Design a protein around this ligand. Structure first.
Ligand SMILES: CC(=O)N1CCN([C@H]2C[C@H](n3cc(-c4ccc(Cl)c(N)c4)c4c(N)ncnc43)C2)CC1
Ligand SMILES: [Cl-]
Length: 287
């Protein structure tokens, strides 16, 4: 009935728009506009706190609001150190604003791309990043939740070079809830899509392991674009015929072995994030 525009008000998460000073735009993707801000008297006590506010673009489409609200409810449920922390919101009688943790160093891909022309990033730094994101995904899988997109773009980096999983707009439950859900078709970048997602549109938690395998590639390549040059059809055939991405330039032999474990044909035989987090710690403790 009620048009999707009208949003419900959650009492715990509603923050006064009067107690918020917006500022410099941090980015404006298809997800929406995110600006830097600081909020006074946030979560009880007592001073101001520098945050980041996502919002609708000036030319927002209904699906953008539908996904921004689908991003809201997922952020409400989850609370984890390596998952960007939702601090508040501004829904009623005004533009919808999501007050979220401020991860200064920016998108992980932007963090990796900036460093290779310039800060110095050791190899031990990269395995720590994947180990951080493995724990965060481990937490989300313990919530029995699929994140779907998972890429070096959607991962954030906070103060002290700490990872924060973000962009929960496309998330879905591994076991469905709504009796009638409108499925958001073909929104995931084909290169990060698991073979089954390409084949049968199935986005499981083991599919996010496939996504994590591509993410590992992005990290070690420092922002590299996966499967270069290949069009969409040629990629589907490549994965169907059996080929994957080859061992990247200056990547560990046991690290590349893990990447192929995530691109296994059968999702049933794919390592789980809890058993992946142990594989990444074993890599650092040697060094
Ligand atoms: C086109 C494209 O591929 N781009 C790459 C990603 N860019 C994002 C803006 C920047 N960003 C975002 C957030 C943020 C805050 C709340 C939420 Cl709910 C979400 N999802 C994210 C954020 C932050 N808390 N602190 C610092 N920077 C931040 C990364 C946009 C452009
Ligand atoms: Cl974003």
């Amino acid at each position: 009935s009620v048009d999707a525009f009208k949003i419900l008000e959650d009492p715990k998460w509603e923050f006064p728009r009067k107690n918020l000073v917006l500022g410099k735009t941090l980015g404006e993707g298809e997800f929406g506009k995110v600006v830097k801000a600081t909020a006074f008297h946030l979560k009880g006590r007592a001073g101001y706190t520098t945050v980041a506010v996502k919002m609708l673009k000036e030319n927002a489409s209904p699906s953008e609001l539908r996904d921004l609200l689908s991003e809201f409810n997922v952020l409400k449920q989850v609370n984890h150190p390596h998952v960007i922390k939702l601090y508040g919101a501004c829904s009623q009688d005004g533009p919808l604003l999501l007050i979220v943790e401020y991860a200064k160093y920016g998108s992980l891909r932007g963090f990796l791309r900036e460093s290779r022309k310039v800060r110095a990033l050791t190899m031990g730094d990269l395995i720590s990043f994947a180990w951080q994101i493995s724990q965060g995904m481990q937490y989300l899988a313990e919530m029995k939740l699929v994140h779907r997109d998972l890429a070096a773009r959607n991962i954030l980096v906070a103060e002290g070079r700490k990872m924060k999983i973000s962009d929960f707009g496309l998330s879905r439950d591994v076991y469905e809830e709504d009796s009638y859900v409108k499925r958001s078709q073909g929104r995931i970048p084909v290169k990060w899509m698991a073979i089954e997602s390409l084949f049968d549109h199935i986005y499981t938690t083991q599919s996010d392991v496939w996504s994590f395998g591509v993410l590992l590639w992005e990290i070690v390549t420092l922002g590299g674009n996966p499967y270069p040059g290949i069009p969409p059809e040629r990629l589907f055939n490549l994965l169907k015929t059996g080929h994957r991405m080859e061992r990247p330039d200056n990547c560990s032999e046991e690290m590349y072995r893990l990447m192929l474990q995530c691109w296994k044909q059968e999702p049933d035989k794919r390592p789980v994030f809890a058993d992946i987090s142990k594989d990444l710690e074993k890599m650092m403790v040697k060094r």
